[PDB]
Amino acid sequence: NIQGITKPAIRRLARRGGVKRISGLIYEETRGVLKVFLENVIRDAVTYTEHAKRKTVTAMDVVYALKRQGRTLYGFGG
């Protein structure tokens, strides 16, 4: 399931960031960081929805978890 992040996907991601020669294990360095990041948002976001006795993380629970992480997402506020 961690190999769902494909090789031209990370290539396009680094191409958006402006990287000319994208390396090898870099592709394994990205999904690792993507495993570090996406955990740290989800560990907070279900913690918000478990206080209201709910089994569904909404967009606002993602916004609150990201505001806890230090970066404010705009275009998902309901």
């Binding site: 991601l13 960031g17 360095e29 990205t30 990041f37 560990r43 569904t56």
Partner: protein, 89 residues
């Protein structure tokens, strides 16, 4: 396409990671912190995670390509992605 592919995705504005493997990875992470139970994920909540993670990854790559040219390199290395995760806190 060294001088071609650099000027296309920056002018473009849509997603780069596919929605369904990202959703499957987000659910496989969500079942860890829910004591092992299935969990409903809204369509806005998955796209929010996608838009956050894509922006975070391109920011981490554009903050590491300046460390690539610092060592006289044009080839990105994981030493630059582990150094960019050190001067951020």
């Amino acid at each position: 396409g060294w001088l071609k592919e650099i000027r296309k995705l920056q002018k473009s504005t849509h997603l780069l990671i596919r929605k369904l493997p990202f959703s499957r990875l987000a659910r496989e992470i969500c079942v860890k912190f829910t004591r092992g139970v299935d969990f409903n994920w809204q369509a806005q909540a998955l796209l929010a995670l996608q838009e956050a993670a894509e922006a975070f990854l391109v920011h981490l790559f554009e903050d590491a390509y300046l460390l690539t040219l610092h060592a006289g390199r044009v080839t990105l290395f994981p030493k630059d992605v582990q150094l960019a995760r050190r001067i951020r806190g």
